[PDB]
Amino acid sequence: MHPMLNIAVRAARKAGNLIAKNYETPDANDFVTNVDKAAEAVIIDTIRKSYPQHTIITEESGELEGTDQDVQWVIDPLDGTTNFIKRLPHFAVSIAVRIKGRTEVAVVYDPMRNELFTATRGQGAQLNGYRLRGSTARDLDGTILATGFPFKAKQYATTYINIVGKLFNECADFRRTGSAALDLAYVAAGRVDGFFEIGLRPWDFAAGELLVREAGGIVSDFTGGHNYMLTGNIVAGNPRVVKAMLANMRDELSD
Amino acid sequence: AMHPMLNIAVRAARKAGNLIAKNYETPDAVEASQKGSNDFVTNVDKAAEAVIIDTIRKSYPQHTIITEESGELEGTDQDVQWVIDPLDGTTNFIKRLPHFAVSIAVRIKGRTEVAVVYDPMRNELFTATRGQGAQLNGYRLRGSTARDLDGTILATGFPFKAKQYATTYINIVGKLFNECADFRRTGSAALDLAYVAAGRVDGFFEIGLRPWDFAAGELLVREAGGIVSDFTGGHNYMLTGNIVAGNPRVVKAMLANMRDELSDALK
Amino acid sequence: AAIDAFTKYLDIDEDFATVLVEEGFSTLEELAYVPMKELLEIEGLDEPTVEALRERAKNALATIAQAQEESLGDNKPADDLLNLEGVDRDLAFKLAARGVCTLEDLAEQGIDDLADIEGLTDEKAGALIMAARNICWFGDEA
Ligand SMILES: [Mg+2]
Ligand SMILES: [Mg+2]
């Protein structure tokens, strides 16, 4: 848990350094993808030097294998890309290392605020030396929902709207900074009570789901199942609020 | 040079924000109490408001002050007002969500003249003075140059104090989601207005906002190329608390889109 | 620190003396026999009282054994945690030892939570947890 985490942390460090460096060339749709590729490539170099056996899984490069196919590196060098496209500073790098059909290492690093959340299965998820103890809410009273509008899954638009309508009738308020990984980190660190989003992808939540579960929370799909890994339908938070949310949101779904 | 009252206001906001940051790293010192709907108010609010009032009275012992807590402290004069929010997004500071700001603006003869908002967590300082413009830490602010409701990002707020409009509100958002790309929700009206003036989000709108939660941001978005209005194109937004703001094209498109979805109570 | 142990050891009458840690009274099995070269240093306990000491010593060993077998059973897989279909007595051992001695807190444990369970794979564990979610969250019963 020490060496893998140290390597991942150094990788996220280099990624965040390059990202923040390139964040100072003001321009007013492509160069964002260029620096994305560059950060992904220096991450790839970090993967090749240290442990050249593991395999890499990126939204961009798909999956690039080596010899140890049992150790997958799921590295999103940027989440909430549109923010960095608009200079809105809410974005992070999400490193994940899955071993034996299961996530084991997780890191989410915002270089702007310098937020470096780490997570090993079992021993838990730390932040800068602090332990994330989830949220204290037992229901949907006065709580905050890290809600995410499906700007890539417009098919479920109206369904999602009715769902969030019922929620806001029941719950208190939403938040959306346009960064799934950071949303998961925040709901993990008790900064926002509950979280739920539609149509996500493994390279996005790969680390955040572990960050949440290690914080006395759970991650599931809209039907309590465990296929949210690929169905992109995720609800997360400490179990009280997740139960209180599912009990209200089940009866207006379509999947 | 630098507008005088603007300098006093930014110094006061700096001190208040330093106190805010000080209270932030201590999740013990905050001793809040619930006052409205799904939100507390902390002792930190009182401390920051006190610091701001004192710093203002130091160099202005007669100006009128306005605040959510102290209502309206009528100084010996009543033409120079200081609308103050020592915290926008107290809900976030409760949960220590690092996204909030202090807000200070000055009204002269009813017209906002200088305004500042301050995010201590990112050390961002949105200043804006009338007839000279808005600045972010020393850079000009022009707002998003987007020309239509396509690909835009829309900042908004849910009416946790007036949830009756929610349904209507929902429909509005629903309608908007037909065209716009994505929304934004930070629970901080002032910072939403700033981001609009910052060109970070390409449009903002909220149903039923408090007067001292935009009187600083509205001058920012004004002098940053953007315009503000109510949901019917009028100037009564200061009373209804119903705000839309952004560059002229996106504001016009939003108003055209919402002319139907809206309810007659709001118009 | 033995005050709960020697309650009734030399207990034909407790107003004789407190037990002796000079020989230890802290092995309880290798102390089944200590010769009379050192067991003449006790006073006020004649030979019938010595046989009574042996009887109450068997009783004290019984007390320590009972304390052992009672503190061990911090598992208590209950009927509400045994009735669960697919959850036998042994899976109930392992689950009530995992850290959830109930069902409501059980529906609040994911796959990786209930992984490494003796007698359950990953997929069937997930199916059982989903069934527990049906019986605690989805069924909407009380
Ligand atoms: Mg990505
Ligand atoms: Mg306020």
UniProtKB/Swiss-Prot annotation, chain B:
Keyword Ubl conjugation annotated: no
Effect caused by changing D88N: Loss of IMPase activity, still complements dnaB121 helicase mutation
Enzyme class: hydrolase
Highest taxon above the source species: Bacteria
Record key words, sorted: Chaperone, Cytoplasm, Hydrolase, Magnesium, Metal-binding, Ribosome biogenesis, RNA-binding, Transcription, Transcription antitermination, Transcription regulation
Effect of R140C: In suhB10; decreases polypeptide chain elongation rate, grows at 30 but not 25 degrees Celsius
Swiss-Prot/TrEMBL induction comment: Transcription is autoregulated. Repressed by the Nus factor complex (NusA, NusB, NusE (rpsJ), NusG and SuhB).
Additional information: E.coli makes very low amounts of myo-inositol-containing phospholipids, so the catalytic necessity for this enzyme is low.
Role: Part of the processive rRNA transcription and antitermination complex (rrnTAC). The complex forms an RNA-chaperone ring around the RNA exit tunnel of RNA polymerase (RNAP). It supports rapid transcription and antitermination of rRNA operons, cotranscriptional rRNA folding, and annealing of distal rRNA regions to allow correct ribosome biogenesis. This subunit may play a central role in organizing the structure. Has D,L-inositol-1-monophosphatase and beta-glycerophosphatase activity, has less to no activity against a number of other substrates. 2.5-fold more active on 1D-inositol-1-monophosphate than L-inositol-1-monophosphate (1D-myo-inositol 3-phosphate). Specific activity increases significantly upon heating. Only beta-glycerophosphate and adenosine 2'-monophosphate are alternative substrates.
Full protein name: Nus factor SuhB
Organism: Escherichia coli (strain K12)
Underlying gene: suhB
